[PDB]
């Protein structure tokens, strides 16, 4: 059977109540193995499955810094997107992103994906080729034009076809 | 293993 590793990020703004809330969960098939919550007291990625606890401190460090840095990108984005849509500063808004990869029964790369949404609807997603973008609207098109000129697709493709598949295979074996 | 942080703004 094939398998999948998927990460789900969620940033919710809260005007007059501090920085946005950031939650990140990682899945290997139907099993959640890690989690990050900006409102929790540890401020670090945490294990939620037994087979991941064995990972080293460098892993936890790296994964913690990476998700946090992503959360900061999301807060700049929450502002940018409010302007694109011309909404008030008082409302709360959401940015969601799911990304992952599927491997075959033999653990070979099958598919990869990186998709995001604004306020529960599609915004910008990377096409199957992992080389081009699909913009769901006018606002996303603005993003697409910037991104197609800065080659952010190549950055994601390297991860989705490289790092993603290789770690999924590690998780599959350790679990 | 999480993807590197997105550096490109929307």
């Amino acid at each position: 059977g094939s398998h999948s590793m998927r990460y789900f990020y969620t940033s919710v703004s809260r005007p007059g109540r501090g920085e946005p809330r950031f939650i990140a969960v990682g899945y290997v098939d139907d099993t959640q193995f890690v989690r990050f919550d900006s409102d929790a007291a540890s401020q670090r990625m945490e294990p939620r499955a037994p087979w991941i606890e064995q990972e080293g401190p460098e892993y936890w460090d790296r994964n913690t810094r990476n998700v946090k840095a992503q959360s900061q990108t999301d807060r700049v984005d929450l502002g940018t997107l409010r302007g694109y849509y011309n909404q008030s500063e008082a409302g709360s808004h959401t940015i969601q992103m799911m990304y992952g990869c599927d491997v075959g029964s033999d653990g070979r790369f099958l598919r990869g994906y990186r998709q995001d949404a604004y306020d529960g609807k599609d915004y910008i997603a990377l096409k199957e080729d992992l080389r081009s973008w699909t913009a769901a609207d006018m606002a996303a098109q603005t993003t697409k034009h910037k991104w197609e000129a800065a080659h952010v697709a190549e950055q994601w493709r390297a991860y989705l076809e490289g790092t993603c598949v290789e770690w999924l295979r590690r998780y599959l074996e350790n679990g | 293993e999480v993807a590197p942080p997105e550096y490109h703004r929307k």
């Binding site: 969620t10 919710v12 939650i23 959640q32 989690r35 949404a117 | -």
Partner: protein
């Protein structure tokens, strides 16, 4: 967009008085993420109530699993009270051991 929650109440293991397991409330299909879910025993909020980490389905709507350990009996009634911006009043779904 704003979508209203679906609520499913069920026990971790098939209900049989004299045994034990957890009463579960799975809320899904909602947006935004702000939501309040309570497990009630005969109409009172159960003090203990754990829940999973915020995740979402392909359509971006959220889902949460709330659970608590309990002892199923003939008399004790169980329910899940949910509050969300999309509702006028907190929706309550009673636990039916046959579902």
């Amino acid at each position: 967009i704003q979508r209203t929650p679906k609520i499913q109440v069920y026990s971790r293991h098939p209900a049989e008085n004299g045994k034990s397991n957890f009463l579960n409330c799975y809320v899904s299909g909602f947006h935004p993420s702000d939501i309040e879910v309570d497990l009630l025993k005969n109409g009172e909020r159960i003090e203990k109530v754990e829940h999973s980490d915020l995740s979402f389905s392909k359509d971006w709507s959220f889902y949460l699993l709330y659970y608590t350990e309990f002892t199923p009996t003939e008399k004790d009634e169980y329910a899940c009270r949910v509050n969300h911006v999309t509702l006028s009043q907190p929706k309550i779904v009673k636990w039916d051991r046959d579902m």
